[PDB]
Design a protein around this ligand. Sequence first.
Ligand SMILES: *C(=O)c1cccc(OC)c1OP(=O)(O)O
Length: 106
Amino acid sequence: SIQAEEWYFGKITRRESERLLLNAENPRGTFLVRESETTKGAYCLSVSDFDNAKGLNVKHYKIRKLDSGGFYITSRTQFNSLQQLVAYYSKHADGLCHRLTTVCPT
Ligand SMILES: *C(=O)c1cccc(OC)c1OP(=O)(O)O
């Protein structure tokens, strides 16, 4: 159950995800997963970042889910569940702006 997950914010808008993530107290990698605004069946991983060029900012990554079963951001790297995907990206930055660190505070 992905809805049981504390990092799953469900049906919130992209603007709302940015409002929650653009809090000065959020370190790099603060994140949440929400439904995509327009892609049916896809989730969206919203992640905070920070650098001297952009300062505090937010990145969004589409998470696909196949009827065939797998969840992924890139088709080359798939998982059996959204939870496993989140766990993998909490250890590997790979192509993301930062590895996932802590769940976005309400
Ligand atoms: C996720 O689906 C996603 C990925 C990349 C960019 C955006 O919006 C900027 C995004 O959020 P969405 O709700 O528009 O799909």
